[PDB]
């Protein structure tokens, strides 16, 4: 179960400077390349140390490619001012995600290519890769234009053709970084919330990759409906962190067990309060 | 390698 994606964003600027184009590439959700219009010498730059391999032509060709995209984006924004009839003073966001998930048989399992305008679904290539879906009346013009110019065929040829090829190349090229994971470490804390009740908290720290599960149980029973839980966050070192918490009566805190599941954990971790 | 786009909107 693998993927590659390219998330590109373009933002209008009223005044002199032109739209902003930023393109970032992720492999298995982990940033590997990036390119910013607002840089001084704007080029595609690697972001993982394993992309240091690729020869100066790689950079040059993707750079010039992306300047291609910058303009493609510039124009596409202005077109959309006309379709919706918007005034001159404004800022506007065009964004695009596009990619290819792979089966383990090194085989295209689904392709993605879609756009959005003011963070709303504009248009998107259906699963077939021969048919689009278009949201509001304006998208129905762009489908028109792209059904006339046989756009489907050419994306398709990248998604199946070129994208999949390069996902392999990257994977093999960057192998000693795709192994890496960090097991979480974890402790429990005791914060006397009310007169009568306390708050225990299961802290998970220093773990990569991102996904994780925290479960407070009371005598073999989960309390998911009662607990408080905070969406995982990044520490900054590249690790992550996340905790969960439950309300218990004073004195009876030794019933309550918390558990932590993680890829990096060989065996799952189970926790208890101690004074 | 990055998506190249074809026809403007």
């Amino acid at each position: 179960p693998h993927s590659m994606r390219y998330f590109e964003t373009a933002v209008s600027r009223p005044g002199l400077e032109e739209p902003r184009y930023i393109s970032v590439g992720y492999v298995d959700n982990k940033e590997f390349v990036r390119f910013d219009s607002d840089a001084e010498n704007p080029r595609y730059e690697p972001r993982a140390p394993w992309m240091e391999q690729e020869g100066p032509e790689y950079w040059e060709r993707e750079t010039q490619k992306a300047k291609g995209q910058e303009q493609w984006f510039r124009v596409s924004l202005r077109n959309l001012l006309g379709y919706y009839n918007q005034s001159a003073g404004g800022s506007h966001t065009l964004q695009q995600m596009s990619g290819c998930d792979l089966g383990s048989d090194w085989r295209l399992l689904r392709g993605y290519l879609q756009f959005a305008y003011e963070g709303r679904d504009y248009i998107a290539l259906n699963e077939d890769l021969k048919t689009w879906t278009a949201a509001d009346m304006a998208a129905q013009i762009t489908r028109r234009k792209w059904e006339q110019s046989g756009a489907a065929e050419h994306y398709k040829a990248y998604l199946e053709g070129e994208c999949v090829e390069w996902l392999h190349r990257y994977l093999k090229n960057g192998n000693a970084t795709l192994l890496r994971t960090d097991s979480p470490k974890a402790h429990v804390t005791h914060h006397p919330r009310s007169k009568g009740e306390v708050t225990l908290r299961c802290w998970a720290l220093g773990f990569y990759p991102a996904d994780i599960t925290l479960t407070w149980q009371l005598n073999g029973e989960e309390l998911t409906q009662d607990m408080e839980l905070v969406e995982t966050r990044p520490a900054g070192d590249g690790t992550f962190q996340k905790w969960a918490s439950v309300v218990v009566p004073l004195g009876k805190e030794q019933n309550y067990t918390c558990r932590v599941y993680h890829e990096g954990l060989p065996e799952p971790l189970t926790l208890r309060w101690e004074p | 390698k990055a998506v190249y786009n074809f026809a403007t909107m």
Partner: T-cell receptor, first 110, second 112 residues
Framework: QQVRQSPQSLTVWEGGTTVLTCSYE??????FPWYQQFPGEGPALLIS?????DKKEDGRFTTFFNKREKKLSLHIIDSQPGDSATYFC??????????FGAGTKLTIKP | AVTQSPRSKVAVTGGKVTLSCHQT?????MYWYRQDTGHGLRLIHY???????EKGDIPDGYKASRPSQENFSLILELASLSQTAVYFC????????????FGAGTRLSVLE
Amino acid sequence: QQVRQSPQSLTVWEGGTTVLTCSYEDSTFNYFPWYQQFPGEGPALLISILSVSDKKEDGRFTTFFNKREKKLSLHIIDSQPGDSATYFCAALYGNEKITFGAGTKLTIKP
Amino acid sequence: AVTQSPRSKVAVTGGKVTLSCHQTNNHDYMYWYRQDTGHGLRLIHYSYVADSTEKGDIPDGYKASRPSQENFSLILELASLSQTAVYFCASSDAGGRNTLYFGAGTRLSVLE
């Protein structure tokens, strides 16, 4: 040069088949259109083909593609005198600037 | 619809020649190509927006101008015997693999 076109100049009889050839040196190139230039007029797109297809066929024009030897070609079947033009084989990668050949000058003698 | 003018021009060497083009295709890319002997299409200059331009493969001796979105122009500061040729304007939509649309052409004799 980057896109090579041969012959330079060609005369063939009405009714004949005609074969224009083309060879390219950027293995990475993807998409190949063919322009048609009738004298008195600027070029105009005739037929085009991706590197995933092996042939594209537009009704008495048909273009053939070959990766191994990095070569491709255009076949006119009936070859009548309303086909007397210069033909350009074109080549590009990604969204790069279309690269145009030298041209072959086709005279369909009636 | 692309349209060039003048359709034909004769010039003395060291002279100033300006050829203009004009497109109602509403495109942003515009290209000055040079055909020698009816043979080849070689890029001189192009322009992806007004009012800036970029050097092609044959930039030497040619200057370029994109006043409006619709108007793109080639300038031969001092005409030379090399520069005698047929000249082609073309527009195209931005993005990859779009079809260029050409002007009918401009022939230039530069004479001693």
